[PDB]
Design a protein around this nucleic acid. Structure first.
Length: 97
DNA sequence: GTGAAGGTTCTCTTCAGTATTAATAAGGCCACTGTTAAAACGTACTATATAGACATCTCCACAAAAG
């Protein structure tokens, strides 16, 4: 408590979580579909980005709601939550999948 | 006429002619070329409208080292 140059900022816990999520590369393909571990997903703006690779963040405890990111101006930007179609109801862990 | 047959003159004609307005024409066979529509007909430099043998990237699944 005495040896801190300044008291740390109270981190927004969703931001911590978002940067704790592991991530993979896939390309949005035809119809705004993207494959990830046999599941398929889509979200509210995906199809406009069909044809290029996007960065998407996943939590192995619940893969059903992916967060997907574009790279533009060589900067990361969030697109939308890509939901596993028909599974937007209860959680699925990666290990059984 | 009492009826029939027959006698007689009548002129001059140097005057009249010559001009437009004109209708599409009124020729028919023969043969022989040479245009004049206009019909029939070989084939070219094109403008597209496909149909489908291929090449490609992507997503998902297996052996080697460290705690």
């Amino acid at each position: 408590e005495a040896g801190l140059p300044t008291v740390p900022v109270p981190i927004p816990e969703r931001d911590l979580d978002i940067c704790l999520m592991k991530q993979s590369r896939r390309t949005v393909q035809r119809g705004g579909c993207l494959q990830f571990q046999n599941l398929m997903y889509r979200g509210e703006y995906l199809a406009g980005y069909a044809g290029e690779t996007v960065n998407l963040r996943f939590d192995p405890r619940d893969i059903t709601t992916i967060l997907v990111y574009r790279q533009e101006n060589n900067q990361e930007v969030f697109l939308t939550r890509a939901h596993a179609q028909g599974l937007e109801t209860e959680q699925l862990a990666l290990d059984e999948a």
